[PDB]
Design a protein around this ligand. Sequence first.
Ligand SMILES: [Cl-]
Ligand SMILES: [Cl-]
Ligand SMILES: [Cl-]
Ligand SMILES: [Mg+2]
Length: 229
Amino acid sequence: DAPFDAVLFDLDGVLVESEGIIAQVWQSVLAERGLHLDLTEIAMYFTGQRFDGVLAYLAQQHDFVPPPDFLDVLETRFNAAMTGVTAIEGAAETLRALRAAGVPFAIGSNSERGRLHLKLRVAGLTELAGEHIYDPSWVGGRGKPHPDLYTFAAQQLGILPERCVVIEDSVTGGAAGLAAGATLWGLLVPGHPHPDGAAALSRLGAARVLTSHAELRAALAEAGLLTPA
Ligand SMILES: [Cl-]
Ligand SMILES: [Cl-]
Ligand SMILES: [Cl-]
Ligand SMILES: [Mg+2]
């Protein structure tokens, strides 16, 4: 009984750390303008939100309306900041282990193509991540939670999606993996923000919810993909 042929990876929160970096930018730019919010609130409510929706949040929850230069200063600083994206601990080790064992894998991300590649570059993961790196431009813009990216990535590997395991840290991405017919394993490495938590991923239908790359590697071995410690 060997359930999987291949692994499909999310990028943000799973292979690279960028949402923590984004949260810190929000935090410092607001702080400079009077408002001091904690990193957990900013990650929870600012990330992946449209600028006008962040403004609405600030006005409703914090009675706060930012100065005229808010939009210009955040863009400067979100720019300067993408260069500091870093590899999730143990991510390179997982990619290295899968390459050594000849297990096919792909990356699916909603990031614009150049930003996807920039993040793998700055995180030192380009060579490990390989050829199968897919953003929504490959599927006509139909990104997660649509299953399209993962269906396509499986197809590019020549593996049936039902025989893939998807490694994700959000409902948006986990949903895309389940809707493609894959098995979902949530990965929530602590000390980095994720858009959703363990209970939401399990209720969504994650078969398990892992908390480190070391844990992931053990699970992949139980599943017959890697060699057990
Ligand atoms: Cl790493
Ligand atoms: Cl994504
Ligand atoms: Cl991503
Ligand atoms: Mg993610």
